[PDB]
Amino acid sequence: NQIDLNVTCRYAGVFHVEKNGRYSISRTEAADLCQAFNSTLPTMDQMKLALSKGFETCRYGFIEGNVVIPRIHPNAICAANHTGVYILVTSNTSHYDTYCFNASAPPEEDCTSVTDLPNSFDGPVTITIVNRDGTRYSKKGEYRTHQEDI
């Protein structure tokens, strides 16, 4: 019973979380997942400020109100070569990665590793935070509050 959470650098508190190496997070799960990091889904303004500090990914993820990809450098296979916060407009499907926002993180680029999941609750899952540098933090718990996400 294991969940891998790949996480990034934070940029003005905003970071990306990919679950189990595939688009697998629902909007309800995303809010619960960010809550386990004492975080919330970023607002569009928070995400735009993170972008300005150096944040970009090549993956769709929830923010408050939309599913987006922050892009700095145009890449044909990431958000159809767009720059800025690219907003997904048309999709059949509901599961993506998520972004999270931690107000207590540093104001600009923070590329230290994540070493805690501070607000997970008691539960049976081995949750492993996987940093981009491969360092890992694991803890037994749960963060999903909606049965349909389990």
Ligand SMILES: Cc1cccc(N2CCN[C@@H](C)C2)n1
């Ligand atoms: C990955 C990285 C490393 C150092 C700086 C940086 N940014 C500075 C602010 N603006 C961004 C376009 C780029 N991004």
